[PDB]
C-alpha cells in the first residue's frame, strides 16, 4: 500500500570496463574473414579504422 516514493526499485549497475585488455563480452556480429595486402576499413574488435 505504500506510495510511489517508498516502493522497491530493483537496481542493477552494469559496470563495464572499456579498456585495452582482450575483450571477452561483446555483441553478436557475424565476424567475417579478413583481407590482407589491400587496405580495408575494419571494425577489428572495436578498433574501427582503415
Amino acid at each position: 500500500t505504500n506510495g510511489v516514493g517508498y516502493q522497491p526499485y530493483r537496481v542493477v549497475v552494469l559496470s563495464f570496463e572499456l579498456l585495452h585488455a582482450p575483450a571477452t563480452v561483446c555483441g553478436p556480429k557475424k565476424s567475417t574473414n579478413l583481407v590482407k595486402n589491400k587496405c580495408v576499413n575494419f571494425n577489428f574488435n572495436g578498433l574501427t579504422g582503415t
Binding site: 572499456l18 574501427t48 579504422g49
Partner: protein, 50 residues
C-alpha cells in the same frame, strides 16, 4: 645540424600533440566516434578539434 634538429623537434612535437585529450574522453577519433551518439559525440568532437 642545429636548424635541422630544431625543425625536427617542431615536427615531432606537432605529431605527439595528437595523444592529448584536451579535456575530451578519448584521443583516437574513431573510438570517441564509435561509442557515442551524435548529439553527445559532437561536443567532444568539437573540443578535440579546437
Amino acid at each position: 645540424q642545429d636548424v635541422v634538429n630544431q625543425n625536427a623537434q617542431a615536427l615531432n612535437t606537432l605529431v605527439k600533440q595528437l595523444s592529448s585529450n584536451f579535456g575530451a574522453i578519448s584521443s583516437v577519433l574513431n573510438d570517441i566516434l564509435s561509442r557515442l551518439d551524435p548529439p553527445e559525440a559532437e561536443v567532444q568532437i568539437d573540443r578535440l578539434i579546437t
